[PDB]
């Protein structure tokens, strides 16, 4: 079984900063391609960004500088840095591990920003 | 004359459809999909043999 521990969300004022994070525990393999998915309220889900095992990054949005991904190879976890928040990014985040055989999903974190 | 006519007929036989949809191997290969193309090519081979 695979468990994706997500943390770091909540209520933050506009222009604030925070640290989303998830740890992948259980039966993972070797390619281990990971990333994030955003779900707006009552809307479709889109891919935020993606990080592979070779430190290659692929952002699926014009969000460079805003979002930055850090890797923990020793424990193999993914951190995402929220800075300079705007209300347009108020959506729930689930990180995604497509991996090699069976892809998995997180349970959810509420990130909210309003003024 | 017998030699020349036999050779000419053998060469001319390549232009027949033999029940397929076309007499050009490349045309039938490009136009259709591997199963039906295989069927048509089988027809062409069994005629030319």
């Amino acid at each position: 079984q695979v468990q994706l521990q997500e943390s770091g969300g909540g209520l933050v004022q506009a222009g604030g900063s925070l640290r989303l994070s998830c740890a992948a525990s259980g039966s993972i393999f070797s390619p281990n391609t990971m990333g994030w998915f955003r779900q707006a309220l009552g809307k479709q889900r889109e891919g935020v960004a993606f990080i592979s095992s070779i430190a290659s990054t692929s952002y699926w949005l014009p969000v460079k500088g805003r979002f930055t991904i850090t890797r923990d190879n020793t424990k193999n976890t993914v951190h995402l840095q929220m800075n300079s928040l705007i209300p347009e990014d108020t959506a729930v985040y689930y990180c995604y591990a497509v991996d090699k055989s069976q892809d998995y999903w997180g349970q959810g974190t509420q990130v909210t920003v309003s003024s | 004359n017998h030699n020349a006519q036999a050779l000419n007929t053998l060469v001319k036989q390549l232009s027949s459809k033999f029940g397929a949809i076309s007499s050009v191997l490349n045309d039938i290969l490009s136009r259709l999909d591997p199963p039906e193309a295989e069927v048509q090519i089988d027809r062409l081979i069994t005629g030319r043999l």
Binding site: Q44 | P34, P35
Partner: protein, 49 residues
């Protein structure tokens, strides 16, 4: 085997001589959601077959 399509081209290919068989069944009850089940993704761009 030998069927042309986007999913066949870029997601799953079956050999022309494939042996065995496929089974498919509807999954509205489980694999569908009123808000939309989208956990399943398909590749629609790819350079080569």
């Amino acid at each position: 085997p030998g069927q042309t399509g986007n999913i066949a081209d870029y997601n799953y290919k079956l050999p022309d001589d494939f042996t065995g068989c496929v089974i498919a069944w509807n999954s509205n009850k489980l694999d569908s959601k009123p808000s939309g089940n989208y956990n399943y993704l398909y590749r629609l761009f790819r350079k080569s077959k």
